[PDB]
Amino acid sequence: TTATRLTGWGRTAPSVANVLRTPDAEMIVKAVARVAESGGGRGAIARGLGRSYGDNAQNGGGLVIDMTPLNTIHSIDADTKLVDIDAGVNLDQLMKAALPFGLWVPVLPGTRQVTVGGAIACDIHGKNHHSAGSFGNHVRSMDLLTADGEIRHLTPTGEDAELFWATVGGNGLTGIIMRATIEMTPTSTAYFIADGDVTASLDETIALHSDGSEARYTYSSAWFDAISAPPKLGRAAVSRGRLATVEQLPAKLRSEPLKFDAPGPIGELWYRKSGTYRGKVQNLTQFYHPLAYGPAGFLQYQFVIPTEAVDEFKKIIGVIQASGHYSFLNVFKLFGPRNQAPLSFPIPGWNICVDFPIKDGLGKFVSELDRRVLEFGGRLYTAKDSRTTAETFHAMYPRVDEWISVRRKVDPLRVFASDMARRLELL
Numbered sequence: 547t548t549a550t551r552l553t554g555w556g557r558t559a560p561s562v563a564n565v566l567r568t569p570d571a572e573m574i575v576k577a578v579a580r581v582a583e584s585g586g587g588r589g590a591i592a593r594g595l596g597r598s599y600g601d602n603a604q605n606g607g608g609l610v611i612d613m614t615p616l617n618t619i620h621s622i623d624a625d626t627k628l629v630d631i632d633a634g635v636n637l638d639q640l641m642k643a644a645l646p647f648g649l650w651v652p653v654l655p656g657t658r659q660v661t662v663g664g665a666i667a668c669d670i671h672g673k674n675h676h677s678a679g680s681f682g683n684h685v686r687s688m689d690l691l692t693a694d695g696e697i698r699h700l701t702p703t704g705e706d707a708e709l710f711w712a713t714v715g716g717n718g719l720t721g722i723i724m725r726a727t728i729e730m731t732p733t734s735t736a737y738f739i740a741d742g743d744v745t746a747s748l749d750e751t752i753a754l755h756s757d758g759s760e761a762r763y764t765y766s767s768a769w770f771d772a773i774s775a776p777p778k779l780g781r782a783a784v785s786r787g788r789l790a791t792v793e794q795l796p797a798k799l800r801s802e803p804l805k806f807d808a809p810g811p812i813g814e815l816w817y818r819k820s821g822t823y824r825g826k827v828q829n830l831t832q833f834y835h836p837l838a839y840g841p842a843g844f845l846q847y848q849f850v851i852p853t854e855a856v857d858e859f860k861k862i863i864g865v866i867q868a869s870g871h872y873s874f875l876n877v878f879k880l881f882g883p884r885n886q887a888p889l890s891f892p893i894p895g896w897n898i899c900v901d902f903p904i905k906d907g908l909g910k911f912v913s914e915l916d917r918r919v920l921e922f923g924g925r926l927y928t929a930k931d932s933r934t935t936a937e938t939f940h941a942m943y944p945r946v947d948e949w950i951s952v953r954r955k956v957d958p959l960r961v962f963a964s965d966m967a968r969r970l971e972l973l
């Protein structure tokens with residue numbers, strides 16, 4: 547309907563597309579039919595809230611279907627723990643709606659501004675990955691509008707399970723998720739009980755994550771230093787916890803356990819001695835979400851290295867700090883077991899997101915990082931990428947051919963297409 551210039555969150559690789567934006571599900575069905583009618587052409591991609599940094603929710607010279615008007619919560623059930631929602635409902639909306647039922651969104655990323663469609667398509671992960679897996683693990687069914695114009699009901703097992711698992715992490719390339727049922731996590735409060743620790747070095751950070759203590763916490767992540775020289779390199783502030791029960795709340799908060807409330811060298815000493823603490827009761831915002839639009843001069847880079855390749859992980863961190871590219875915003879987490887989605891990002895291992903200001907030599911440097919990540923058995927995350935190559939990506943994802951095989955069965959005429967799909971030869 548409306549021609550619009552589109553970028554991801556990273557404000558990079560702009561491309562103009564025809565954007566459809568309607569709450570009418572049948573207009574969406576018809577729009578897809580029109581693309582298949584004179585198709586494939588440049589095809590169509592779904593788009594949620596545009597929070598992926600890269601080019602997966604854009605389609606230069608083709609159609610983009612903005613899914614955010616499709617935002618109905620159909621039902622929430624405390625007995626079965628199931629929510630039935632349109633793919634355009636966002637996680638903030640869902641979190642608020644589900645709390646009074648004693649239910650918790652089972653996987654929450656670092657912003658609540660993502661759609662359910664976006665969460666499935668990038669198979670997102672959170673602080674609780676090591677205990678809960680990623681978003682795809684909790685989908686009980688979804689309705690997918692496929693290239694033929696049919697809406698397929700998909701489930702994680704049984705008939706069409708292959709297509710379900712291709713859609714999880716599928717970056718919108720199997721079709722348009724219209725609706726889904728998610729199994730929620732039961733909770734008696736909206737609060738976490740948290741332990742904080744501060745480490746002096748990378749070795750001590752790795753030791754903390756390898757000593758077995760991760761088994762005591764359902765939620766775990768850390769900020770880490772990627773700028774100091776060794777041994778300060780890789781020191782971290784670690785925050786770990788679990789959902790609080792009602793009696794763990796200060797008496798004052800007990801009447802309303804499920805309410806979500808409204809949002810130098812001296813700096814280091816404070817951050818360090820007070821960064822260590824035990825059994826601190828924290829609301830969702832303080833434990834997780836300190837909370838606009840993201841700046842334009844930064845490259846987001848996220849990769850995971852297999853748990854066993856720990857020496858190799860230490861080497862990549864060393865390479866980063868000696869590069870003359872400086873990142874202050876650095877997340878670190880140890881992932882748990884992967885799921886069965888062929889293109890799912892998380893594997894067990896050392897997960898890092900760094901944020902580099904765009905300077906001369908950055909592009910070629912991150913290409914060298916790609917090489918290292920690949921060599922050591924790791925991979926990068928599509929939701930954060932706009933610049934890796936088809937060659938590197940296919941090698942990072944050993945089940946890519948399996949996934950492409952599914953994609954071609956469900957979309958032979960390439961009705962579904964994006965800038966990422968062409969760049970990474972997934973089309």
Ligand SMILES: Cc1cc2nc3c(=O)[nH]c(=O)nc-3n(C[C@H](O)[C@H](O)[C@H](O)COP(=O)(O)OP(=O)(O)OC[C@H]3O[C@@H](n4cnc5c(N)ncnc54)[C@H](O)[C@@H]3O)c2cc1C
Nearest residue numbers: 594595596597598655656661663664667670671717718723
């Ligand atoms: C500040 C910030 C913090 C973040 N933290 C995390 C984190 O902790 N963990 C993590 O895993 N990710 C994180 N992300 C990335 C984010 O979770 C993903 O990029 C997510 O997919 C974005 O959701 P969206 O609705 O904005 O989707 P978009 O960016 O609009 O789309 C992303 C992909 O989803 C597809 N898609 C969207 N809706 C549909 C649909 N209805 N049917 C089919 N396909 C669809 C699109 O085609 C596209 O391929 C973060 C991003 C930001 C900006």
Ligand SMILES: CCOc1ccc(CNc2nc3cc(C(F)(F)F)ccc3nc2C(=O)O)cc1
Nearest residue numbers: 655656657671672673674767877878879897899
């Ligand atoms: C200064 C802007 O404010 C913010 C807003 C959000 C954040 C946290 N963001 C993230 N947390 C993340 C947390 C994890 C996790 F799960 F904890 F390991 C993984 C990826 C993450 N990616 C981002 C991101 O920015 O892409 C940091 C700062």
Ligand SMILES: C[C@H](CO)OC[C@@H](C)OC[C@@H](C)O
Nearest residue numbers: 852882883884893894923944
């Ligand atoms: C997808 C990936 C191959 O690069 O496989 C993940 C391996 C390391 O982990 C196994 C799961 C069950 O924990």
